[PDB]
């Protein structure tokens, strides 16, 4: 806002694995305010990923994050006739909460059979450095570098 | 202080270049009076002294020739 400095609120850690980062993932996933269905979607999907690829479900979910987390993005600034982007580094809290949004929107597009399927796949490709989430991260990184002489 | 040529009450001369080189910069431009403190009556003679030494090649016009 104009003057206020805002302290954020801690959300309840997830019931199963006791990690607030997971508990934030379901909150972004949840649509229309219903955690019961959303928690089922993530829990079944995470179980699917963990069974197929490796152990330590927390690390299994984490590996996708380090492949989608952005580093620098562009914010538009206007001076005269035309406005041009300016690169700027991204704070760590934004990086964690920007990646989950990219994954979720990517999942909602895949034409799989059910939401538990699409989320399961999207985390799988991201853990292998592939998929719509990673390309969207790449588009930001390529555009922040296509024009970066501005500062 | 600012008294250098006030003791030497003459006309500032052009064959004495050891005096002159302290009133020019590294590039060869003339230092303004506001820095050296020389008064107006002796700055004009000093300015003419340089331009008489510049023509006779005793002093450089510019830094790079």
């Amino acid at each position: 806002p104009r003057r206020r400095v805002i302290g954020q609120r801690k959300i309840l850690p997830d019931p199963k694995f006791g990690s607030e980062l997971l508990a934030k993932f379901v909150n972004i996933l949840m649509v229309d305010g219903k955690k019961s269905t959303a928690e089922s979607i993530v829990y079944s999907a995470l179980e699917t990923l963990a069974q197929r690829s490796g152990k330590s479900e927390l690390e299994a979910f984490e590996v996708a994050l380090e492949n989608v987390r952005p580093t620098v993005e562009v914010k538009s600034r206007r001076v005269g006739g035309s406005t041009y982007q300016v690169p700027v580094e991204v704070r760590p809290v934004r990086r964690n909460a920007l990646a989950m949004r990219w994954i979720v929107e990517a999942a909602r597009k895949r034409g799989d059979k059910s939401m538990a399927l699409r989320l399961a796949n999207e985390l799988s490709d991201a853990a292998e450095n592939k998929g719509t989430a990673v390309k969207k991260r790449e588009d930001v990184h390529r555009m922040a570098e296509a024009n970066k002489a501005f500062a | 202080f600012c008294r250098f040529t006030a003791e030497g009450v003459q006309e500032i001369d052009y064959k004495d270049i050891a005096t002159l080189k302290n009133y020019i910069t590294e590039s060869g431009k003339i230092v303004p009076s506001r820095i050296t403190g020389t008064r107006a009556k002796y700055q004009r003679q000093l300015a003419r002294a340089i331009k008489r030494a510049r023509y006779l090649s005793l002093l450089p016009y510019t830094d790079r020739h």
Partner: protein, 70 residues
């Protein structure tokens, strides 16, 4: 502003020394002035309007010196 680098040192002091050499020489303060032609009446008006403003701040300093704000 010809500068010859000295014995060793890193690149920066000689580089930053070069910039300080040009600032004293005022090379950039001249090229921008001669980039376009200003009419001799604008030449005199600009010089005077700078001087009278320079003096006005000089007298206004003593006015604020004598007064207190709180």
């Amino acid at each position: 502003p010809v500068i010859k680098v000295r014995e060793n040192e890193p690149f920066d002091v000689a580089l930053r020394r070069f910039k300080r050499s040009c600032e004293k020489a005022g090379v950039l303060a001249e090229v921008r002035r001669r980039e376009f032609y200003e009419k001799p009446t604008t030449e005199r008006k600009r010089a005077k309007a700078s001087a009278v403003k320079r003096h006005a701040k000089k007298l206004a300093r003593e006015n604020a010196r004598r007064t207190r704000l709180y």
